[PDB]
Amino acid sequence: VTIAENCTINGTLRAEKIVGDIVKAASAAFPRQRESSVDWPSGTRTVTVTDDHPFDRQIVVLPLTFRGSKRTVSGRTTYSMCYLKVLMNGAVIYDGAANEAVQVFSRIVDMPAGRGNVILTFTLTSTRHSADIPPYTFASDVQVMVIKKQALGISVV
Amino acid sequence: VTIAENCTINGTLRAEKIVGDIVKAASAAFPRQRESSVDWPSGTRTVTVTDD
Numbered sequence: 001v002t003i004a005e006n007c008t009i010n011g012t013l014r015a016e017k018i019v020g021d022i023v024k025a026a027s028a029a030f031p032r033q034r035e036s037s038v039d040w041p042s043g044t045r046t047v048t049v050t051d052d053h054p055f056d057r058q059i060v061v062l063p064l065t066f067r068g069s070k071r072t073v074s075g076r077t078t079y080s081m082c083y084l085k086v087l088m089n090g091a092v093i094y095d096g097a098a099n100e101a102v103q104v105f106s107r108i109v110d111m112p113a114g115r116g117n118v119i120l121t122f123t124l125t126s127t128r129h130s131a132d133i134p135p136y137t138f139a140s141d142v143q144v145m146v147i148k149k150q151a152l153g154i155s156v157v
Numbered sequence: 158v159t160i161a162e163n164c165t166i167n168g169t170l171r172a173e174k175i176v177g178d179i180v181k182a183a184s185a186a187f188p189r190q191r192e193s194s195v196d197w198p199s200g201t202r203t204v205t206v207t208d209d
Contacts, residue, residue, distance in 0.1 A: 003158050007172075011162040015170035022175060023182045054171075060184045108184055147182045152174050154183035155205045 019053055021153055024146035030124050030139055041066075041082075041139040044123040049146060051116055058147050059109040059118060061086075066139040067102045071129050078129035082137040087121040098137075111146075120144065176209060 031043030049059055069080045079099050086094035088109055096103050111118045122142050126135035188200025 001158075007158045007160075009160045009164045011160065011164065013164050013166075013170075015166040017169040018175070019169060019171040020173065020175040021181070023180045058184065060182075108186060145182060147184065151181070151183070153181040153207065153209075155207075156183040156185045157203045157205075 021148040021151040024049075025144070027141055027143040029141045030122070033126075035134050038134055038136070040126045040135045040137050041124050042126050042135075044121060045142050047120040047122070047142070047144050049111060049118045049120075049144075051111065051114060051118070054113055056110065056112045056149050058149050059111055059120065060145045060147060061105065061107045061109070061120070062143040062145065063104045063106040064122075064140055064142055065102050065104050066096070066098050066124065067137065068097075068099045068126075069129075069136040070100050071133065071136070078133070079127075080129050080135045080137055081127045082139060083123075083125045083127075084139070085121075085123045085125075087119075087123075089119055090121075110149075174209075181206075 026047055028045045030041040030045060032039040033042040034040075049057075064084070066082045066084050068082045071078050071080070082098040084094065084096045084098075084103075084105060085092065086105065086107070093109075094105060094107065096105060109118065109120065124139050126137040128135045183204055185202050185204075187198040187202060189196045190199045191197075
């Protein structure tokens with residue numbers, strides 16, 4: 001069926017695939033490495049978006065908050081840094097580090113139509129205070145949405 | 158087309174605008190003003206939502 005203008009269903013629409021201006025969403029938590037009683041985020045999450053749409057799309061990475069720590073023992077101060085590296089199709093697009101203050105990563109990745117699948121890799125690494133004290137870092141979940149760009153519902157200029 | 162009851166699609170539904178029980182979204186970044194080797198966010202963004 002090809003409808004050139006408005007189509008109005010007054011009941012229930014049961015569609016398998018929708019290629020409209022709806023939102024797509026995926027989410028995951030970083031793998032946790034643990035010892036004794038404490039764990040920290042350390043690992044990689046790979047998000048694949050297929051180019052199965054006829055219009056360009058925006059992949060929005062929602063605010064991801066990552067933070068390290070500082071510990072002073074016997075007057076000696078040690079840092080536990082949290083490194084977040086974000087790759088688009090194998091090319092580094094973000095490389096951030098947190099020591100004490102929180103760092104927030106939220107980005108827009110322009111995926112066009114027909115260019116191919118877009119792969120976003122989020123690698124997070126935590127460094128220990130010393131050989132005996134494990135890393136003490138925090139990192140929130142990675143959440144990714146796909147939106148339409150230049151849509152008629154919401155516009156942004 | 159006007160349908161008074163359920164409509165079922167066994168393939169791909171491709172609509173430009175969808176009006177009902179859906180989650181719309183938009184996003185942008187603030188303009189950045191820069192000098193030498195340092196930039197900072199400073200600017201205006203507008204989000205318009207249509208009453209449709």
